[PDB]
């Protein structure tokens, strides 16, 4: 109060202190059952896979991503994501994914990186130098490779022009390697342009056969339809929480309700916009939603020269929020509740008043409007006066103010 | 041919709960007692979205196409009803110039004595759907009364529209328009009653 | 409660506490205005059990003692006909019941002790002969009501009769207590309906803002939404000040009929309502004050021929108290508001100066008993 | 920068103003009342009920103070009561006398 | 009488329609002003001639 008056000296009187608010006493995120996973599962364990001049892709979309199934697996020899670190992934979103995959020889992985050079980077998949996405990848010696070699994994060794960003090239066309002409058949400086790793169990890991996948993420004008999956924390009722029901956030004592919502219907809203009411997304009720308990904070007190004591109300909360008593104005605390009544002395509202008295404490009574008086009427009795006081009565009025005048030049600027 | 819509084609204009309350809001709805274009068939414009109805029960109104060319060069929706509920799929299909049912990709999807009513709007690459079936006495014009089309579907599929035509006994086709609606919701929070703010000086 | 928010809000300075001091001095206004009402009274005067009133029937404005709060009948008609987002509405200080206590001590004060609770400690007077001085106030002779008791308390309990009926056929009745409350709820949802208003700012969602954008960004669009609430607070504040500027006029001077027209009776023409001014009776309701005007109206007029003075042995006589006036031949002296015709005598006038200078004087015999 | 200040200065100086011009109005309402209980009150005799303070007015002396006016209202307040039997008339030769 | 601004002023909210409606309030209570002082007499009395 001292503080809140700019003063050491404090009149009599009941002062708004401060603002009582409930906090938060947990935070609640719902969103509805999580469901349509990507397929990614059926990439990574495939019996075939594809050769690296005619990689395979699928489009994924309107699905959640959950990178954390990949990511969190120790299984893979290689995962590099580009622009993004791979924990952020199970929180953006994109309007598809494709999953780029193939086999080489684990060497030539090196090869699978923005703007790399080399056979299989220039002449079968090609990363721009500004990639943002996943390449993924582990050895395969286990699937991929035969006693005597496994021929039918094939790589482009020849190009005349380097394959672009994303692009692919199925062709067997001969490569002219001079002036010689070739007519579409092998032979000399005309050279057949697929190439084999011949798989084998005793290859060491630079031969061995690698599986690779590249996530490949975009981004359009059309939404997007793949995203990382939300988490659901456990619901509360009756206690004052911080929420996230969808993409609706706020904070309140959430409750069970009455309402009965339409079956495509998500939020209740009362008649000035404010949120009153939510379903929850995954056990369709209606919750309904009611602010934390908030209001002023007033110090009633006797003059500071007259006592150090005082007590505080919590204006218009209940005290299994917050002697202590309940008013109707609020919950009052080191107050004295008195049976008997007085005139008022410091106004607290609802009928109480608070008044320093007796060992003299603040008590609280509900205020006396003045002394009953059954007048003695009859139809046949009047009362008149033997005699008279004249009285002096002082009536106090305001006549003027104090002349202000300003500068508004000096004020602003000066 | 033409008929006067009444007060037919509101639809709820979120996905919110409010009860007791008169609500005001701006969306493309059908104006009231417009003329709605009626046929027993022809490519229509889109416009910025388009209310469609029709007296069925035979289901010989099958579905639907909506793009641009409707024909192979870009993206186009198809959406057909199979007799037991709703089909749909997206890509640039080469279909004929006039198709009938006999009496790369991006996107699919599985779902008289009756008036079927439908509203269909695309916004920033959702395609909109909303519905109502109700029981009639009248065989020519639109039925005179008021009950709300509510939500069927939401769809994410990024394509742009211009054009749209109905795969097939009266239909009817009004294109929508950006007025200032006032909504009664009841206890029920059901839209029960509209007025159409541009309609008339009482109205407004 | 945004903490990014809240931090911007502090550099505006002492803008939030002199809207909450503003908006105090309003409330305790609200009280004060109530107290300066209804609190005119030193003691809580009650009737007494028997209601032998001279055969007035105040029972439809007394308490009723089986209502759940001591409200009149007409005070239950009354207030039966009126009808979160960091925004608290405070109690009165004085609940709907003491204020019904109120009502109360001042109509039993006013039934039992007429003007004379007003003057000093109440006075039990007949209310047979309060309203007899209270006839003789307006310059009708008491005799004019003691003559007429049974016509005047008809014709008052049948006008009791008639606000029940008038309060009932339509809330529109009390329009002004009813434009009150709408005012200030029409006030509220304003202010709360421009929490979703955007200022220029990139959404009206301060959390949204939050998410959009990064830290400088972010600041720079919650500054619009800061100066737009700020803007509206002080335009919601600006208009509560200027609309209880309106309302304390108004307590004011029902605070005056309070004083002049229930705890006495008022000479101010049409101040108590209109005709002659006998009593009125104070009846609370939500957020107001109603009084019942018990007024006298003439009401059946002759027309009479009249002269301003009368000669007698050349000596001018003029009335002490009325008027004269002509029976078509013969001549008497009446009281000026009610028809009441003597005969002419030295005692019912008085003589100056003589029967040349009066202009329009007639010639007549003044009785001398 | 220097626009900020002169925003928030002038919109600090226009609450100003503006609580100053409903502050006036309270005063201007205060003053006029005052001038009424002068005119009134001290130079004549109110029959208006409590206008001049509680009892019936005999007169009243204006003072002066800072800001303000101050009225010194004499009052005669019956002080001392007696109950007697009443009546509205008394009966003589058949004929009613009224006081 | 400009779309381009008049589609920025709505993103202020109320603030319009709210100036319109206290300026119509000073407005129609001009009338009632009048009607108080003057309107006082319930017939229209004539001097005779
Ligand atoms: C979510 O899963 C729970 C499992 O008990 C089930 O009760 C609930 O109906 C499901 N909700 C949805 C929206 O699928
Ligand atoms: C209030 O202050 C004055 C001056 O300091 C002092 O004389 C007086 O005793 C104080 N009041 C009480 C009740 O002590
Ligand atoms: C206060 O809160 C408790 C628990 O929510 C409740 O039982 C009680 O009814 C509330 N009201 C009062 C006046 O105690
Ligand atoms: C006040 O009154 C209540 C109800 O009669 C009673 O329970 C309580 O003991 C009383 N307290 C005091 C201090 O008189
Ligand atoms: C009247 O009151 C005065 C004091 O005010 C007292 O002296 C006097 O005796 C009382 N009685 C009479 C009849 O004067
Ligand atoms: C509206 O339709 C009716 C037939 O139902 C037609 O007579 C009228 O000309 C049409 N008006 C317009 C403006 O289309
Ligand atoms: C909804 O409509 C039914 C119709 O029978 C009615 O019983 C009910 O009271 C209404 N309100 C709610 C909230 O169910
Ligand atoms: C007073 O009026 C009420 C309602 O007209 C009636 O019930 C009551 O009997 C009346 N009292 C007397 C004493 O006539
Ligand atoms: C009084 O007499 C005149 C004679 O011309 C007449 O016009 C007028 O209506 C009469 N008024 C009453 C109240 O009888
Ligand atoms: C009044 O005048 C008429 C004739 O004008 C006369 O008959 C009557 O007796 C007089 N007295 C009374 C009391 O009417
Ligand atoms: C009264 O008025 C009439 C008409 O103006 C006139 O004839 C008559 O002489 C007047 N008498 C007096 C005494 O003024
Ligand atoms: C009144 O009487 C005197 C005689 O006593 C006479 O001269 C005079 O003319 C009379 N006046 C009238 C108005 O009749
Ligand atoms: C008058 O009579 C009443 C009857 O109860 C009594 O209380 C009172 O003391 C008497 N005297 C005066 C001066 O009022």
Same mark, same amino acid.
């Given at each position: 109060?001292?503080?809140?008056?700019?003063?050491?000296?404090?009149?009599?009187?009941?002062? /708004?202190?401060?603002?009582?608010?409930?906090?938060?006493?947990?935070?609640?995120?719902?969103?509805?059952?999580?469901?349509?996973?990507?397929?990614?599962?059926?990439?990574?364990?495939?019996?075939?896979?594809?050769?690296?001049?005619?990689?395979?892709?699928?489009?994924?979309?309107?699905?959640?991503?959950?990178?954390?199934?990949?990511?969190?697996?120790?299984?893979?020899?290689?995962?590099?994501?580009?622009?993004?670190?791979?924990?952020?992934?199970?929180?953006?979103?994109?309007?598809?994914?494709?999953?780029?995959?193939?086999?080489?020889?684990?060497?030539?992985?090196?090869?699978?990186?923005?703007?790399?050079?080399?056979?299989?980077?220039?002449?079968?998949?090609?990363?721009?130098?500004?990639?943002?996405?996943?390449?993924?990848?582990?050895?395969?010696?286990?699937?991929?490779?035969?006693?005597?070699?496994?021929?039918?994994?094939?790589?482009?060794?020849?190009?005349?022009?380097?394959?672009?960003?994303?692009?692919?090239?199925?062709?067997?066309?001969?490569?002219?390697?001079?002036?010689?002409?070739?007519?579409?058949?092998?032979?000399?400086?005309?050279?057949?342009?697929?190439?084999?790793?011949?798989?084998?169990?005793?290859?060491?890991?630079?031969?061995?056969?690698?599986?690779?996948?590249?996530?490949?993420?975009?981004?359009?004008?059309?939404?997007?339809?793949?995203?990382?999956?939300?988490?659901?924390?456990?619901?509360?009722?009756?206690?004052?929480? $911080?929420?996230?029901? $969808?993409?609706?956030?706020?904070?309140?004592?959430?409750?069970?309700?009455?309402?009965?919502?339409?079956?495509?219907? /998500?939020?209740?809203?009362?008649?000035?916009?404010?949120?009153?009411?939510?379903?929850?997304?995954?056990?369709?009720?209606?919750?309904?939603?009611?602010?934390?308990?908030?209001?002023?904070?007033?110090?009633?007190?006797?003059?500071?020269?007259?006592?150090? /004591?005082?007590?505080?109300?919590?204006?218009?909360?209940?005290?299994?929020?917050?002697?202590?008593?309940?008013?109707?104005?609020?919950?009052?605390?080191?107050?004295?509740?008195?049976?008997?009544?007085?005139?008022?002395?410091?106004?607290?509202?609802?009928?109480?008043?608070?008044?320093? /008295?007796?060992?003299?404490?603040?008590?609280?009574?509900?205020?006396?409007?003045?002394?009953?008086?059954?007048?003695?009427?009859?139809?046949?009795?009047?009362?008149?006066?033997?005699?008279?006081?004249?009285?002096?009565?002082?009536?106090?009025?305001?006549?003027?103010?104090?002349?202000?005048?300003?500068?508004?030049?000096?004020?602003?600027?000066? | 041919?033409?008929?006067?819509?009444?007060?037919?084609?509101?639809?709820?204009?979120?996905?919110?709960?409010?009860?007791?309350?008169?609500?005001?809001?701006?969306?493309?709805?059908?104006?009231?007692?417009?003329?709605?274009?009626?046929?027993?068939?022809?490519?229509?414009?889109?416009?910025?979205?388009?209310?469609?109805?029709?007296?069925?029960?035979?289901?010989?109104?099958?579905?639907?196409?909506?793009?641009?060319?409707?024909?192979?060069?870009?993206?186009?929706?198809?959406?057909?009803?199979?007799?037991?509920?709703?089909?749909?799929?997206?890509?640039?299909?080469?279909?004929?110039?006039?198709?009938?049912?006999?009496?790369?990709?991006?996107?699919?999807?599985?779902?008289?004595?009756?008036?079927?009513?439908?509203?269909?709007?695309?916004?920033?690459?959702?395609?909109?759907?909303?519905?109502?079936?109700?029981?009639?006495?009248?065989?020519?014009?639109?039925?005179?009364?008021?009950?709300?089309?509510?939500?069927?579907?939401?769809?994410?599929?990024?394509?742009?529209?211009?054009?749209?035509?109905?795969?097939?006994?009266?239909?009817?086709?009004?294109?929508?328009?950006?007025?200032?609606?006032?909504?009664?919701?009841?206890?029920?929070?059901?839209?029960?009653?509209?007025?159409?703010?541009?309609?008339?000086?009482?109205?407004? | 409660?945004?903490?990014?928010?809240?931090?911007?809000?502090?550099?505006?300075?002492?803008?939030?506490?002199?809207?909450?001091?503003?908006?105090?001095?309003?409330?305790?206004?609200?009280?004060?205005?109530?107290?300066?009402?209804?609190?005119?009274?030193?003691?809580?005067?009650?009737?007494?059990?028997?209601?032998?009133?001279?055969?007035?029937?105040?029972?439809?404005?007394?308490?009723?003692?089986?209502?759940?709060?001591?409200?009149?009948?007409?005070?239950?008609?009354?207030?039966?006909?009126?009808?979160?987002?960091?925004?608290?509405?405070?109690?009165?200080?004085?609940?709907?019941?003491? #204020?019904?206590?109120?009502?109360?001590?001042?109509?039993?004060?006013? #039934?039992?002790?007429?003007?004379?609770?007003?003057?000093?400690?109440?006075?039990?007077?007949?209310?047979?002969?309060?309203?007899?001085?209270?006839?003789?106030?307006?310059?009708?002779?008491?005799?004019?009501?003691?003559?007429?008791?049974?016509?005047?308390?008809?014709?008052?309990?049948?006008?009791?009769?008639? #606000?029940?009926?008038?309060?009932?056929?339509?809330?529109?009745?009390?329009?002004?207590?009813?434009?009150?409350?709408?005012?200030?709820?029409?006030?509220?949802?304003?202010?709360?309906?421009?929490?979703?208003?955007?200022?220029?700012?990139?959404?009206?969602?301060?959390?949204? #803002?939050?998410?959009?954008?990064?830290?400088?960004?972010?600041?720079?669009?919650?500054?619009?939404?800061?100066?737009?609430?700020?803007?509206?607070?002080?335009?919601?504040?600006?208009?509560?000040?200027?609309?209880?500027?309106?309302?304390?006029?108004?307590?004011?001077?029902?605070?005056?009929?309070?004083?002049?027209?229930?705890?006495?009776?008022?000479?101010?023409?049409?101040?108590?309502?209109?005709?002659?001014?006998?009593?009125?009776?104070?009846?609370?309701?939500?957020?107001?004050?109603?009084?019942?005007?018990?007024?006298?109206?003439?009401?059946?007029?002759?027309?009479?021929?009249?002269?301003?003075?009368?000669?007698?042995?050349?000596?001018?006589?003029?009335?002490?108290?009325?008027?004269?006036?002509?029976?078509?031949?013969?001549?008497?002296?009446?009281?000026?508001?009610?028809?009441?015709?003597?005969?002419?005598?030295?005692?019912?006038?008085?003589?100056?100066?003589?029967?040349?200078?009066?202009?329009?004087?007639?010639?007549?015999?003044?009785?001398?008993?």
């Amino acid at each position: 109060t001292k503080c809140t008056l700019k003063s050491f000296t404090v009149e009599k009187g009941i002062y /708004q202190t401060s603002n009582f608010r409930v906090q938060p006493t947990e935070s609640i995120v719902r969103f509805p059952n999580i469901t349509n996973l990507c397929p990614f599962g059926e990439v990574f364990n495939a019996t075939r896979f594809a050769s690296v001049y005619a990689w395979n892709r699928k489009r994924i979309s309107n699905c959640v991503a959950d990178y954390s199934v990949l990511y969190n697996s120790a299984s893979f020899s290689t995962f590099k994501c580009y622009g993004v670190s791979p924990t952020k992934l199970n929180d953006l979103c994109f309007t598809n994914v494709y999953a780029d995959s193939f086999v080489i020889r684990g060497d030539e992985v090196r090869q699978i990186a923005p703007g790399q050079t080399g056979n299989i980077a220039d002449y079968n998949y090609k990363l721009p130098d500004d990639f943002t996405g996943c390449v993924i990848a582990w050895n395969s010696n286990n699937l991929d490779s035969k006693v005597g070699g496994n021929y039918n994994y094939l790589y482009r060794l020849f190009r005349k022009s380097n394959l672009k960003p994303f692009e692919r090239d199925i062709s067997t066309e001969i490569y002219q390697a001079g002036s010689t002409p070739c007519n579409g058949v092998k032979g000399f400086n005309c050279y057949f342009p697929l190439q084999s790793y011949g798989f084998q169990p005793t290859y060491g890991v630079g031969y061995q056969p690698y599986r690779v996948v590249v996530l490949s993420f975009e981004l359009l004008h059309a939404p997007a339809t793949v995203c990382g999956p939300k988490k659901s924390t456990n619901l509360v009722k009756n206690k004052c929480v $911080n929420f996230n029901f $969808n993409g609706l956030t706020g904070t309140g004592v959430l409750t069970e309700s009455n309402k009965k919502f339409l079956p495509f219907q /998500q939020f209740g809203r009362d008649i000035a916009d404010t949120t009153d009411a939510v379903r929850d997304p995954q056990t369709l009720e209606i919750l309904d939603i009611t602010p934390c308990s908030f209001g002023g904070v007033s110090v009633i007190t006797p003059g500071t020269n007259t006592s150090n /004591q005082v007590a505080v109300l919590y204006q218009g909360v209940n005290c299994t929020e917050v002697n202590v008593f309940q008013t109707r104005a609020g919950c009052l605390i080191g107050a004295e509740h008195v049976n008997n009544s007085y005139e008022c002395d410091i106004p607290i509202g609802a009928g109480i008043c608070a008044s320093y /008295q007796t060992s003299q404490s603040i008590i609280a009574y509900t205020m006396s409007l003045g002394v009953e008086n059954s007048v003695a009427y009859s139809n046949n009795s009047i009362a008149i006066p033997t005699n008279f006081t004249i009285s002096v009565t002082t009536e106090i009025l305001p006549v003027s103010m104090t002349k202000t005048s300003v500068d508004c030049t000096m004020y602003i600027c000066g | 041919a033409y008929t006067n819509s009444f007060t037919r084609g509101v639809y709820y204009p979120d996905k919110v709960f409010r009860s007791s309350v008169l609500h005001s809001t701006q969306d493309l709805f059908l104006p009231f007692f417009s003329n709605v274009t009626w046929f027993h068939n022809p490519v229509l414009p889109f416009n910025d979205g388009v209310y469609f109805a029709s007296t069925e029960k035979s289901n010989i109104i099958r579905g639907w196409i909506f793009g641009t060319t409707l024909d192979s060069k870009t993206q186009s929706l198809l959406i057909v009803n199979n007799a037991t509920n709703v089909v749909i799929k997206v890509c640039e299909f080469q279909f004929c110039n006039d198709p009938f049912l006999g009496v790369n990709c991006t996107f699919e999807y599985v779902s008289f004595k009756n008036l079927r009513e439908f509203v269909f709007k695309n916004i920033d690459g959702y395609f909109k759907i909303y519905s109502k079936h109700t029981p009639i006495n009248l065989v020519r014009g639109l039925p005179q009364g008021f009950s709300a089309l509510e939500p069927l579907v939401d769809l994410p599929i990024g394509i742009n529209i211009t054009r749209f035509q109905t795969l097939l006994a009266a239909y009817y086709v009004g294109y929508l328009q950006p007025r200032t609606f006032l909504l009664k919701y009841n206890e029920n929070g059901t839209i029960t009653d509209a007025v159409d703010c541009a309609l008339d000086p009482l109205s407004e | 409660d945004s903490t990014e928010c809240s931090n911007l809000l502090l550099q505006y300075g002492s803008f939030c506490t002199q809207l909450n001091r503003a908006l105090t001095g309003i409330a305790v206004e609200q009280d004060k205005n109530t107290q300066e009402v209804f609190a005119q009274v030193k003691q809580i005067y009650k009737t007494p059990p028997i209601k032998d009133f001279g055969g007035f029937n105040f029972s439809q404005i007394l308490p009723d003692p089986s209502k759940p709060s001591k409200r009149s009948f007409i005070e239950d008609l009354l207030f039966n006909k009126v009808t979160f987002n960091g925004l608290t509405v405070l109690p009165p200080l004085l609940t709907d019941e003491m #204020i019904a206590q109120y009502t109360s001590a001042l109509l039993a004060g006013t #039934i039992t002790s007429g003007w004379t609770f007003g003057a000093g400690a109440a006075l039990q007077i007949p209310f047979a002969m309060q309203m007899a001085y209270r006839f003789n106030g307006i310059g009708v002779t008491q005799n004019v009501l003691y003559e007429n008791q049974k016509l005047i308390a008809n014709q008052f309990n049948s006008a009791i009769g008639k #606000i029940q009926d008038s309060l009932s056929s339509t809330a529109s009745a009390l329009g002004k207590l009813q434009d009150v409350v709408n005012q200030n709820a029409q006030a509220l949802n304003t202010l709360v309906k421009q929490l979703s208003s955007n200022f220029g700012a990139i959404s009206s969602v301060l959390n949204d #803002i939050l998410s959009r954008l990064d830290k400088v960004e972010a600041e720079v669009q919650i500054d619009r939404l800061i100066t737009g609430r700020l803007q509206s607070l002080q335009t919601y504040v600006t208009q509560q000040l200027i609309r209880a500027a309106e309302i304390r006029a108004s307590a004011n001077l029902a605070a005056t009929k309070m004083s002049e027209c229930v705890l006495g009776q008022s000479k101010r023409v049409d101040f108590c309502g209109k005709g002659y001014h006998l009593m009125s009776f104070p009846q609370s309701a939500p957020h107001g004050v109603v009084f019942l005007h018990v007024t006298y109206v003439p009401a059946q007029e002759k027309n009479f021929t009249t002269a301003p003075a009368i000669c007698h042995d050349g000596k001018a006589h003029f009335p002490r108290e009325g008027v004269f006036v002509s029976n078509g031949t013969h001549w008497f002296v009446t009281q000026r508001n009610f028809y009441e015709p003597q005969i002419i005598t030295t005692d019912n006038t008085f003589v100056s100066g003589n029967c040349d200078v009066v202009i329009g004087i007639v010639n007549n015999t003044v009785y001398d008993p």
